[PDB]
Design a protein around this ligand. Structure first.
Ligand code: NA
Ligand code: NA
Length: 223
C-alpha cells in the first residue's frame, strides 16, 4: 500500500546532503556520509575536519563515514554535482505526485494521530506537539508533501509500527524543518530549505536539503 517509491539516485549515498552548509554544535553523531555542494568546505562548520591524504574527502570524530565538499580534489566536485542534481530530481518527483489520498488532514496537527500508507498533502505548516505513529508493513510507503514548515516538538517522537520502515517514508517539505530538543524523527527529508535538529534529538533516515542543515548536539543515522 502507498505511493510508488521516490528515486534518490546518488543522493541515496548520503546521510546528509546539503547545498549551502552543514553545521554542528559539538558533539553531534552522524552515521553515513555528509556531502556539501556547491558551497565550499568552509561551510562545513564544527566538524574539526582532517583531510584525507588523497584531498578528495575528510573525516571527523562526529561522523562515521566520509565528508565531501565542492572544493575538494577531483573527482569529488563532479560526484557531488551529480548527487545535488539527483536530490533535486527526487524533490521534484516527490513534490509533484498527483492525486493525494489525504488533503489537509487534521489541518496539519499530527500529534496523537495514526498515519496509514498513502500520499498526503498539506498546503499549510505541519507539526506535532505529541508523539504520532506511522503504521503499515515493511513494504508500505508514505509520501508527506508539505508546502509550509514542518516542526516536531521537544521530546516528541515519530513512532513506526506494524513493520513500517524509515527508508519507505518521505517528507518533501518546502518550508524550514525544525526538530526540537530530544525529539525523534523518522524518514527521508527532501527539504527545499533549511533543517535544524536540536540538543539530544535524533533522526533515522536522511536529510537532503537544498540549503543548510544544522545539527545541535544531535544524532542522524542513515536509513
Ligand atoms: Na587517507
Ligand atoms: Na499536534
Amino acid at each position: 500500500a502507498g505511493p510508488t517509491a521516490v528515486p534518490l539516485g546518488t543522493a541515496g549515498n548520503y546521510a546528509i546532503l546539503a547545498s549551502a552548509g552543514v553545521s554542528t554544535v559539538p558533539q553531534s553523531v552522524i552515521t553515513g556520509a555528509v556531502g556539501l555542494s556547491p558551497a565550499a568546505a568552509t561551510f562545513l562548520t564544527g566538524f574539526s575536519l582532517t583531510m584525507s591524504s588523497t584531498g578528495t574527502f575528510s573525516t571527523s570524530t562526529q561522523v562515521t563515514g566520509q565528508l565531501t565538499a565542492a572544493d575538494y580534489g577531483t573527482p569529488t566536485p563532479s560526484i557531488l554535482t551529480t548527487a545535488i542534481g539527483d536530490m533535486g530530481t527526487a524533490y521534484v518527483n516527490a513534490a509533484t505526485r498527483s492525486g493525494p489520498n489525504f488533503l489537509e488532514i487534521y489541518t496539519g496537527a499530527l500529534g496523537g494521530k495514526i498515519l496509514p500508507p498513502g500520499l498526503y498533502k498539506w498546503t499549510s505548516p505541519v507539526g506535532a506537539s505529541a508523539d504520532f505513529t506511522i503504521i503499515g508493513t515493511s513494504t508500505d510507503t508514505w509520501i508527506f508533501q508539505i508546502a509550509g514548515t514542518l516542526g516536531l516538538a521537544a521530546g516528541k517522537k515519530i513512532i513506526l509500527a506494524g513493520g513500517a520502515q524509515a527508508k519507505n517514508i518521505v517528507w518533501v517539505v518546502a518550508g524550514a524543518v525544525s526538530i526540537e530538543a530530544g525529539a525523534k524523527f523518522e524518514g527521508v527529508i527532501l527539504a527545499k530549505t533549511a533543517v535544524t535538529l536540536k540538543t539530544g534529538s535524533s533522526l533515522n533516515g536522511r536529510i537532503l536539503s537544498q540549503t543548510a542543515v544544522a545539527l545541535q548536539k544531535a544524532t542522524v543515522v542513515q536509513k
